[PDB]
Design a protein around this ligand. Structure first.
Ligand code: MG
Ligand code: MG
Ligand code: MG
Ligand code: MG
Ligand code: MG
Ligand code: MG
Ligand code: MG
Ligand code: MG
Ligand code: MG
Ligand code: MG
Ligand code: MG
Ligand code: MG
Ligand code: MG
Ligand code: MG
Ligand code: MG
Ligand code: MG
Ligand code: MG
Ligand code: MG
Ligand code: MG
Ligand code: MG
Ligand code: MG
Ligand code: MG
Ligand code: MG
Ligand code: MG
Lengths: 185, 257, 168
RNA sequence: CCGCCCGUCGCUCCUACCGAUUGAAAGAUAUGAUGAAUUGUUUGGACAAGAAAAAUUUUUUCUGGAAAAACCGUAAAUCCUAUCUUUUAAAGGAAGGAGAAGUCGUAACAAGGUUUCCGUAGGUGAACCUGCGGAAGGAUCAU
RNA sequence: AACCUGGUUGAUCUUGCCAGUAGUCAUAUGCUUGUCUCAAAGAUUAAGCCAUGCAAGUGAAAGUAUAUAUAUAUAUAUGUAGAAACUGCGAACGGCUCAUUAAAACAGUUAUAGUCUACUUGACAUUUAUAAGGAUAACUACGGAAAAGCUGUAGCUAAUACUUGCAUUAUCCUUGGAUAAGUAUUUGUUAGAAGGAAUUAUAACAAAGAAGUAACACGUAGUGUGUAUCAAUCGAGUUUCUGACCUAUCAGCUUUUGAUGUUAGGGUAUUGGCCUAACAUGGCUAUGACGGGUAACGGGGAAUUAGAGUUCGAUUCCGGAGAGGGAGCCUGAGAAAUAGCUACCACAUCUAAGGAAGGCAGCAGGCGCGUAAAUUACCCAAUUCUAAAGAAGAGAGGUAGUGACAAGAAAUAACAAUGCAAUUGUAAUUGGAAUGGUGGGAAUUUAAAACCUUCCCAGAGUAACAAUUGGAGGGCAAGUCUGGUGCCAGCAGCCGCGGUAAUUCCAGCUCCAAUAGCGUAUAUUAAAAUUGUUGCAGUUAAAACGCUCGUAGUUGAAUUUCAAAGAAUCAUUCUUUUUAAAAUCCGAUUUUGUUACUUUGAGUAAAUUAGAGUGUUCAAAGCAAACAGUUAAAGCAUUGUGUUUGAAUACUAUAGCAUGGAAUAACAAAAUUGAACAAGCU
RNA sequence: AAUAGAUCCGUAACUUCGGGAAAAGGAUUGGCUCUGAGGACAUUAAUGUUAACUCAGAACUGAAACGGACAAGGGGA
């Protein structure tokens, strides 16, 4: 028979392929956060739309209802744990005010750039892809990793990286080799 | 041909067995015996999935070959024998005793009773028959015939049965004040007392049960099991004592570190 | 062979059905037993769960009762005289459930030489005129094609008057 | 207005229609005729075990029992008729659409040079003309 | 995201369609392709035809071994193993496909007081005995046939195969006789703890009567095999109510030959026109019968949608049906079975020509058909099933091979210095670091097969380790740049371009869009308030019947108990109190028509869906997991022992079961008459 | 030459709606033994007497024959 494992999509197309303002705004965001395609913007938009839909549905529902209490507390806890709400705006009405730059600020790339530790956002993306970064004793190499609140104080270089106290790379060792046979003969 | 079916597919097995939806296309397909398929659990599931003693089916087999597992005081070697509600289990090698019960969800658990409690169980009466010579026989939920039943026993109350000898010790009536456990939909491990009985003529009888937190629920008559008099129960209960909280306060409790 | 399904009948509206199933062998209809007056003949046929029933092919005696007293006696069957379904079965002398037969009455008259508490029953005359010639009229009450036997009871009362008027 | 535009007729191309030929083909259903195989009951009786004094057997048998027949049933299949559904040939006849600089007239648009139009009925190469009753969507909101 | 643009004109405002736009667990095809994870795949057309190999077997205490082999103790005894064969059980489960089928099948909800039921579980029995019978396999000798899973004759011998058949008690009133001397089942006469309801359990009297209660095996006081009834369990056959697409150029069907009922029987496991005889004239229909069509198997579900809706569902699970087309049948607890048998129609195999054998819509594979679809591979290690039930077997199932169907992540650089228009930026030049892709060897994984993860060695500069597919007049982002052609060649979904100035053809350069992906064709959803219940139009744009009557349908005035007075909250929201009557506890509780409709419950399979928890390195996912410790503390049981967990909840017609009810609607009760009560009178 | 009596089924084109029509076509038929249906009258629903001729079914039977001789349409485009 067919396998019982399933799958789902994560993005969507804009329905209007040549609108000028949307295109300029997307280029703004891509150049600001150093991304690859329009697909990344579209996937973040998809996620935000799901969140907002849940919030709207709960807000229509009766005050001090059981379903409202349970699901609203769960959603607010998730949002505050992700690092998107804060402390004085956990009210299920500040969820509807969340914008795209809010979510797109939590990527490991932006965090690695902002925490010193890298000269540029493109440099940040290159370092993540070359196994130089850890998030709490686990080495991570995916720039779309979204950092949670209790994990943003453990970002650091990896112990197996030349930038974090290990042997140097394939270029240093070859230069040192060649220099050794030059200086011993 | 179109005869009796012999196989069971995994996604069609009863959901309270909690079988992985990967790793296989089949389920153990319990045998015929004292309990129905849907109100029971095979011995392989108990002894591999729950207690984690075996890692495969073949290890359950090599456990049961050496005759050390007794249900209701008799050794069994059938890997798909049905094990049912009030049944006591003894593993001689480890010197352990269990009784299956429902938790507040619909899933069976082994309760880990002691040795003195391991000498009896409770059976509920399903019907009473009159046979040749005007002798009475009782039929229990356990698929069991009891001859020479007491004249004051009716077709819905419960009795307490000795296991070394199949004789009756005492019986408990089915009244307004009796203590009950419920065994079907929407409320499967709930314990309450009883509030009222309805007795609709051609259709089902509805009865109401009041919890120890003054919560009220109702169900059919045919899924009610009397387990004590007004004061106290006659068996030990799992940790929760049949007290079902709702999701909000259950979640609140689970977050107490 | 013979089937007992209703897939080949017309609907109550008069329309006809389209068949998309073969015969299923759990609606058999095996042929009838036309039991006849003669020396004993019984065959065997098995049902579903290997339950046997006994086909009679020829019988000439059985167990007969006298309902007024509650006594049963073995006796011999002489002839069939009336069938209420059709008279083609009195035609060939076939035994079915509701037949009328004539039987030997000597065992019943002999047994009456003990006169259990019905000592004041005042046997009606028509039965006495029947007893004088040695033969009486009875009605079969078993199903010979299923049990392999033929039992009955003595006819009396308005029962007798009805069946006597029907036969003249 | 040196505007626009209508219909026959002649040429080419494509689509569909009527059509003698008791036209042709493939399936479906019903009635009839003949009917393989086989359940049941009856008939039959190669022979296998039986009761007889005799010496291994003479005709007597309660039994068991193969081939083979008959009858009532369950009924594949073949054929002959009768309708029905689908596809399809054709002398000849007669429409529509498209194309090309064709021939004849000028019916409509202005009071289009006889105001236009409706129903009906006649007639004429063609557009159309004429009788009878109606409308204004008229060229008159008025004596 | 509850959205609109180009095209009728000299120009304008409308109706109205044509074209543009986005998605498809939706198919085919063109160009292109570096890494990893996940995994659909001969349905559409031909339920067309098939070479070859495989797909169901089974003995670890316990039926029958002088085929034989072997071990000890001592010609003897106890053992162990065991090709054949008889016996027992299973092959009716599994796997495949969607031809038929339109009140049929199926789904929710009922009944069996109208039935059958192997294996498994619990109860538990009645009318020569120190051990009975005969006969048959395997085996031996003599054979036949071209050929086949063919078999003749003669001679032995076993069984849990096939048969026959022995030895004890309970009641009537510390005596005694009578007797019960009969399990299921059939007939006649009676009596009578449970269910809403009995011709119910059950008991008695008089006749029939199956089948049985161990002439079996092991050595663990125990088991194994077999056995009459009852009950349970795994199941099935029938059965109640409600629920489907298009068609009236289908209006009357059914009934001589069962159509609708009654009576009596037959038959079946049981009810029944299921069948047979006699009788009667019924049954369905404009609320669509009877017919026709479907490129129709039905559900759980899928796609797209603000809310309504529209369109799909051959295909993981459940139900139905079939094995080239029809019909018939044996065994068996279970079959109208097809890797069972018997015939006919079609197709086809071997042959010595006399004869004998056949059924891939099971797994691979071939031909044909077509726009349209993979290996004649490995394994029983996991999930399960069968058996004489650890130990054997399984194209069920798992693993790999092919595979841009579909889904998820993610490379093709980054940095510094110097120059250079504006702190930038980079058409540049220099120079050192960082990395996979790739080759080799290991630790692992796995039935010492290959992926993946992790280490060691080698290894980037034109980082040649070199990204594509469509476009550039408008709709619609992007060139009044060069050369060629000249109403030709060609382009263009639509409006349009093409005669020397072509922003549109053919090329070069440059720009634009999406990007390991991007175009084209057909079908379908939104756009479409262009099918309109929500929600369209009908003077002149398409469209009020010539006019009136009239049945079915749809829709219908007002009226019957309206109030009034306190408490709880920062006028509001809630909540108490009784005011007409009759029946009912020695100046008192509780009852007062039927539906619709609305509230709340019960019962329900998962997968899919919504949704709670949990860092697969993230995500798609999955249903798991978390905690202390270079090897002990700590806890709880007296030396012993790890601990805490999760796998929720909702949803499941419109019909059915129960339940609170004051408003809105319908019905019942209402006169050329109808009651209720005192009192005498049966 | 072939057909033809009677009973039971089934009948097209066309049409002046009256026909065509016995359209075309299919089945049956003896003898013997039985079963069922159809009236009148007088003692009172119950008993008793009493006819005539047709029609419908069943079993059995024979060298598969039966309007057995006589009598008696050929059909269609
Ligand atoms: Mg079948
Ligand atoms: Mg196993
Ligand atoms: Mg004029
Ligand atoms: Mg397939
Ligand atoms: Mg198909
Ligand atoms: Mg199957
Ligand atoms: Mg009849
Ligand atoms: Mg389907
Ligand atoms: Mg299926
Ligand atoms: Mg085939
Ligand atoms: Mg078959
Ligand atoms: Mg065949
Ligand atoms: Mg096959
Ligand atoms: Mg195949
Ligand atoms: Mg393909
Ligand atoms: Mg296994
Ligand atoms: Mg064994
Ligand atoms: Mg160009
Ligand atoms: Mg549409
Ligand atoms: Mg619409
Ligand atoms: Mg809309
Ligand atoms: Mg419109
Ligand atoms: Mg009008
Ligand atoms: Mg004629």
């Amino acid at each position: 028979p067919k396998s019982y494992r399933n799958y789902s999509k994560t993005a969507r197309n804009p329905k209007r392929p040549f609108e000028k303002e949307r295109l300029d705004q997307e280029l703004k965001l891509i150049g600001e956060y150093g991304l690859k395609n329009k697909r990344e913007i579209w996937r973040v938009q998809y996620l935000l739309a799901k969140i907002r839909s849940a919030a709207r549905y709960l807000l229509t529902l009766d005050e001090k209802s059981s379903k409202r209490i349970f699901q609203g507390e769960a959603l607010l806890r998730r949002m505050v744990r992700q690092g998107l709400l804060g402390e004085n705006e956990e009210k299920l009405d500040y969820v509807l005010g969340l914008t795209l730059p809010k979510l797109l600020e939590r990527r490991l790339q932006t965090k690695v750039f902002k925490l010193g530790l890298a000269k540029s956002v493109h440099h940040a993306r290159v370092l993540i892809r070359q196994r130089h970064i850890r998030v709490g004793k686990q080495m991570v190499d995916i720039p779309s990793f979204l950092v949670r609140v209790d994990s943003e104080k453990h970002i650091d270089f990896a112990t197996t990286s030349p930038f974090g106290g290990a042997r140097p790379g394939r270029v240093k060792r070859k230069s040192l080799k060649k220099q050794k046979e030059k200086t011993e003969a | 041909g179109k005869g009796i079916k012999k196989h069971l597919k995994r996604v069609n097995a009863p959901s309270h067995w909690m079988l992985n939806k990967m790793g296989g296309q089949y389920a153990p397909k319990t045998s015929s015996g004292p309990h129905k398929l849907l109100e029971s659990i095979p011995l392989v599931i108990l002894l591999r999935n729950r207690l984690k003693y075996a890692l495969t089916f073949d290890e359950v087999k090599m456990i049961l070959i050496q005759k050390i597992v007794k249900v209701d005081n008799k050794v069994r070697t059938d890997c798909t024998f049905p094990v049912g509600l009030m049944d006591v289990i003894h593993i001689t090698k480890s010197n352990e005793y269990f009784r299956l019960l429902y938790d507040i969800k619909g899933r069976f658990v082994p309760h880990r009773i002691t040795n003195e409690e391991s000498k009896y169980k409770l059976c509920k009466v399903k019907k009473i028959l009159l046979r040749k010579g005007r002798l009475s026989i009782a039929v229990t939920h356990d698929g069991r015939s009891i001859p020479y039943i007491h004249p004051d026993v009716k077709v819905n109350d419960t009795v307490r049965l000795d296991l070394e000898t199949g004789k009756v010790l005492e019986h408990l009536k089915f009244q307004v004040g009796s203590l009950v456990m419920v065994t079907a939909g929407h409320s499967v491990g709930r314990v309450g007392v009883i509030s009222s009985i309805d007795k609709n003529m051609g259709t089902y009888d509805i009865i109401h049960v009041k919890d120890s937190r003054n919560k009220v629920f109702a169900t059919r008559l045919s899924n009610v099991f009397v387990i004590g008099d007004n004061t106290k129960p006659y068996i030990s209960l799992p940790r929760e004592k049949g007290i079902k909280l709702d999701i909000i306060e259950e979640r609140r409790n689970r977050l107490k570190a | 062979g013979i089937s007992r399904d209703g897939r080949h009948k017309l609907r109550l509206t008069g329309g006809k059905k389209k068949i998309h199933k073969k015969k299923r062998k759990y609606e058999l209809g095996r042929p009838p037993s036309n039991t006849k007056l003669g020396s004993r003949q019984v065959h065997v046929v098995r049902g579903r769960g290997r339950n046997y029933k006994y086909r009679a092919i020829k019988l000439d005696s059985g167990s007969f009762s006298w309902p007024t007293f509650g006594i049963s006696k073995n006796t011999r069957i002489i002839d069939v005289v009336y069938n209420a379904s059709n008279n083609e079965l009195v035609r060939t002398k076939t035994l079915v459930k509701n037949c009328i037969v004539v039987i030997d009455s000597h065992p019943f008259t002999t047994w009456y030489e003990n006169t259990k508490i019905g000592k004041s029953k005042n046997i009606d005359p028509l039965l006495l005129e029947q007893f004088k010639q040695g033969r009486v009229l009875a009605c079969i009450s078993s199903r010979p094609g299923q049990c392999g036997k033929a039992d009955g009871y003595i006819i009396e009362g308005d029962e007798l008057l009805f069946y006597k008027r029907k036969m003249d």
